[PDB]
Amino acid sequence: QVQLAETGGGLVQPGGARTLSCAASESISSFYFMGWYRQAPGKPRELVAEISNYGRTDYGDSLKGRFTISRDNAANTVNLQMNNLAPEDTALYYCNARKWERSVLEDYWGQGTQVTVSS
Amino acid sequence: QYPIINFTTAGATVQSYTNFIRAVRGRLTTGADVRHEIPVLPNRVGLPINQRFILVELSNHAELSVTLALDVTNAYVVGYRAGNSAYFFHPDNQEDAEAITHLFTDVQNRYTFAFGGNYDRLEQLAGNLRENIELGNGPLEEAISALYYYSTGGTQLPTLARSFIICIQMISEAARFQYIEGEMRTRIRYNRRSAPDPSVITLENSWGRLSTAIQESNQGAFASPIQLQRRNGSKFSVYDVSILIPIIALMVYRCAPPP
Ligand SMILES: [Cl-]
Ligand SMILES: [Cl-]
Ligand SMILES: [Cl-]
Known part of the structure; x- marks a missing residue:
């Protein structure tokens, strides 16, 4: 049972920034993908960014250029740099790790970190 | 045996x-x-x-x-x-x-x-x-x-x-997937070999997620949407079990159903 721990959430003004960090209970290279998802008010949980073990990335529509997902193999973390924030970015952000187990790609999830953008 | x-x-x-x-x-x-x-x-x-x-x-x-x-x-x-x-x-x-x-x-x-x-x-x-x-x-x-x-x-x-x-x-x-069976049937039918496209790869990656979502679903409704890919690689979301009935043939066991 993998554990994921998120930090970096908080309250910022528009144009503000956040650095979300996700720590894992095992080597991040154990995971085929790691990702960040967010659940905004009224909306279902959605993909923000995913990165594979080989540096392939994918981003939710319109988040490329604004957010950056990156791995830190020394710190053993996956991180989300969030720049030029707007109220639309308010959401609970979740770290995701995906690991092949018995031929099944299993999901692990952090508890989430709130990001609130307020004027 | x-x-x-x-x-x-x-x-x-x-x-x-x-x-x-x-x-x-x-x-x-x-x-x-x-x-x-x-x-x-x-x-x-x-x-x-x-x-x-x-x-x-x-x-x-x-x-x-x-x-x-x-x-x-x-x-x-x-x-x-x-x-x-x-x-x-x-x-x-x-x-x-x-x-x-x-x-x-x-x-x-x-x-x-x-x-x-x-x-x-x-x-x-x-x-x-x-x-x-x-x-x-x-x-x-x-x-x-x-x-x-x-x-x-x-x-x-x-x-x-x-x-x-x-x-x-x-x-x-x-x-596991009628869809992927279909991909192979096509290759066999036209005597062709080819790598699997993003739709196949993402399906494979999603077998566990789909199995969980369907079995844990609230009367067919996914607790969260699952993103899949089209043949051309573009992304789309699935929100319920119904659209997946022609695609998935078998699920890994996750939990017990109600009566
Ligand atoms: Cl031999
Ligand atoms: Cl063939
Ligand atoms: Cl099973």
């Missing part, structure tokens, strides 16, 4: 492949557990060992045969026998380790690989991602030969990993 299903690439047709995959499905589940019109594989927990595996005996144009062993709880290849040698992926746990000891017990040469057989390891060992490994009757023909020749040093490890990747998708994934 375990049930055997035969398939040959020699003279393979849409018909023979269809009958092959349907037979594999029929041996994987008894059809007793169906959820939202999609069958669920047997639950690993408490499953009698006598019901645990099925064998897929593959033959090719060179009339070489290898027998893959499939775990009915995930429809996956756990090892194979070729003549007087058998090879098994390194099991994740003691239970699985105990379970595979019941396979190929008359074989004289028995070997357990140090590595496991999940795609991440197979791709790494092959030096290729699934997106860059061609599928179809030809590739299957070649994989069978490669598998057959491993025991006498005629096959190097990366070629063996690639071969496993081909077999697994054309058998395990085809059984």
Whole structure:
């Protein structure tokens, strides 16, 4: 049972920034993908960014250029740099790790970190 | 003792492949557990060992045969026998380790690989991602030969990993997904080989997520949307079980249904 721990959430003004960090209970290279998802008010949980073990990335529509997902193999973390924030970015952000187990790609999830953008 | 299903690439047709995959499905589940019109594989927990595996005996144009062993709880290849040698992926746990000891017990040469057989390891060992490994009757023909020749040093490890990747998708994934069966049927029909496109790859990546979402769903409604890919790689979200009924053929067991 993998554990994921998120930090970096908080309250910022528009144009503000956040650095979300996700720590894992095992080597991040154990995971085929790691990702960040967010659940905004009224909306279902959605993909923000995913990165594979080989540096392939994918981003939710319109988040490329604004957010950056990156791995830190020394710190053993996956991180989300969030720049030029707007109220639309308010959401609970979740770290995701995906690991092949018995031929099944299993999901692990952090508890989430709130990001609130307020004027 | 375990049930055997035969398939040959020699003279393979849409018909023979269809009958092959349907037979594999029929041996994987008894059809007793169906959820939202999609069958669920047997639950690993408490499953009698006598019901645990099925064998897929593959033959090719060179009339070489290898027998893959499939775990009915995930429809996956756990090892194979070729003549007087058998090879098994390194099991994740003691239970699985105990379970595979019941396979190929008359074989004289028995070997357990140090590595496991999940795609991440197979791709790494092959030096290729699934997106860059061609599928179809030809590739299957070649994989069978490669598998057959491993025991006498005629096959190097990366070629063996690639071969496993081909077999697994054309058998395990085809059984799991009508969609992927359809992809192989197409290749066979038009005598073509080709790498799987993003729709196939993302389906494969999502078998666990789809199984969980469907089985945990609130009366068919997903607790969260699952993103899949079109053939052209574009993304779309699935929100409920209904659209997946023609796509998924088998689910891994996750939890018990209500009455
Ligand atoms: Cl073909
Ligand atoms: Cl050999
Ligand atoms: Cl299962």
